[PDB]
């Protein structure tokens, strides 16, 4: 666990977002970490592929990464 992901474009976007103290739904393509705690309060519209599904960032949100915080595996598999 040398270094988790930094979300470089999402990192710059979040820095610009929270430096102005403005909360915006970032249409975040990045899906490979929420390891950085500064993401709290930013409505990450996770681009699961079909759309940008919002996900909120919490304190205990660390330790697992950003992707299927909004699920992408739409599944019913039984009659629906």
């Amino acid at each position: 666990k040398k270094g988790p992901f930094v979300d470089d474009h999402l990192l710059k976007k979040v820095d610009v977002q929270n430096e102005k103290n403005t909360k915006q739904v970032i249409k975040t393509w990045s899906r490979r970490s929420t390891i950085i705690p500064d993401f709290i309060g930013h409505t990450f519209a996770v681009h699961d592929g079909r759309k940008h599904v919002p996900v909120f960032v919490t304190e205990a949100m660390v330790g697992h990464k950003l992707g299927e915080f909004a699920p992408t595996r739409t599944f019913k598999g039984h009659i629906k």
């Binding site: 919490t58 205990a60 949100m61 330790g63 595996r73």
Partner: protein, 117 residues
């Protein structure tokens, strides 16, 4: 004998008594018995109450034990659900957490093989 709450059977070696516990396993049985000073071969019947107290203090202070392993495993499980992680989603759908086989295998999670119509 007396311990944290997991029985140590009458015909199990001391490491073997430990291995039953969720808190202590065979390798941790060896580690704890080396750190404390109890033989891995001696029985539960040959155990001393002072050694019981010393062992309990050592395991509760330097090892994740029944309570510590629960407050670790389940708390971090619900932690990875509450972050929306697909490790949490493997937990929810009764799947192995590391994304290994869920299609047919992984019965200990989803539950044994069955039969639909």
């Amino acid at each position: 004998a007396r311990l944290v709450g997991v029985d140590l059977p009458r015909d199990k070696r001391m490491e073997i008594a430990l291995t039953y516990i969720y808190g202590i396993g065979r390798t941790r049985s060896n580690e704890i018995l080396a750190a404390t000073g109890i033989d891995k071969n001696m029985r539960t019947k040959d155990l001393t109450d002072d050694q019981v107290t010393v062992l309990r203090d050592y395991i509760e202070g330097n090892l994740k034990v029944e309570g510590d392993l629960r407050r670790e495993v389940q708390a971090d499980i619900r932690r990875k659900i509450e972050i929306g992680c697909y490790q949490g989603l493997r937990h929810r759908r009764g799947l192995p957490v590391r994304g290994q086989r869920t299609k047919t295998n992984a019965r200990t999670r989803k539950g044994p093989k069955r039969t639909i119509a």
